[PDB]
């Protein structure tokens, strides 16, 4: 016991960073959800006769 109080940090960065990716993706997703709603309105028109 010495680094059994040091590895909790080597494995605490790897929590706050994992949560960081996640939180970005949950934002990046709620962003691509707007950009789909903008492809819906664009695909309602029947082929031009």
């Amino acid at each position: 016991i010495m680094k059994y109080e040091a590895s909790i940090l080597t494995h605490d960065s790897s929590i706050r960073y994992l949560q960081e990716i996640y939180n970005s993706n949950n934002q990046k997703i709620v962003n691509l959800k707007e950009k789909v709603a903008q492809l819906e309105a664009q695909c309602q028109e029947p082929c031009k006769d």
Binding site: I8, D12, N25, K33, V36, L39, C43, Q44, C47
Partner: protein, 72 residues
Amino acid sequence: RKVIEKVQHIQLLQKNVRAQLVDMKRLEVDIDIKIRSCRGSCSRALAREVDLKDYEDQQKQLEQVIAKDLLP
């Protein structure tokens, strides 16, 4: 004391990751459909595939990994 407080985070995390891994499936589909739904509106249509075998290969994991915790 500390190593116990970690799991509380490392599980609220992993339960959130499966919740996101869900929507990345629901979306990838909702997308493959809404693009197909353009074939008859727009001059060109995007020629694509959907690899689901991947999603259920890393849904195979995560769960196969969700072991016990710290109770006994």
